[PDB]
Amino acid sequence: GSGTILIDLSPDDKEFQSVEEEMQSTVREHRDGGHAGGIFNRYNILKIQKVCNKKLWERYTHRRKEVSEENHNHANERMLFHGSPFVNAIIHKGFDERHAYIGGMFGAGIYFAENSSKSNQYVYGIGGGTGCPVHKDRSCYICHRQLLFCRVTLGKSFLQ
């Protein structure tokens, strides 16, 4: 089975508060006026869990080094938010580009954002899909959402 352990972080833990602050402080007003991700200036942060998986970590650090050696010994590593309907799969199986939606404006890739409110727009699908499963509401205040705050190797990044 999955070699993923979830480590529950305490609200009083500095690591919790750091990820919490990044989530809250990177909210912005969006051009679609909350159409995709809902209307809000703030989150209710219910849980922050460290995803521990040796297989997925060693896979990441291996590729990070390969990219590093290709880009003047610089990984160009960034902490970035990810939203998609497949967070439960990703924490167990890792990120899989074979499931990437080709219709995206930047092609068949996996999307990250430095704004939490941007990644929130993709939690229920492209353009917020049909919103939450229960109320079919993109701006649902009841249903619990999941984002990933990810270590991402950008290496030599191409501007579009």
Binding site: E97, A100, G107
Partner: protein, 41 residues
């Protein structure tokens, strides 16, 4: 396709057999063959 279908690592077609990989590290260029096509008699 940009990548292998989900659960797959390659594509095989018959439009003769052709094999396609979407990652360069899934092949090693083991032998370099220098040659000419021979004019048939």
């Amino acid at each position: 396709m940009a990548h292998s279908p989900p659960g797959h690592h390659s594509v095989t077609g018959r439009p003769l057999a052709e094999y396609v990989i979407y990652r360069g590290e899934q092949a090693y260029p083991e032998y370099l063959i220098t040659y000419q096509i021979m004019r048939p008699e």
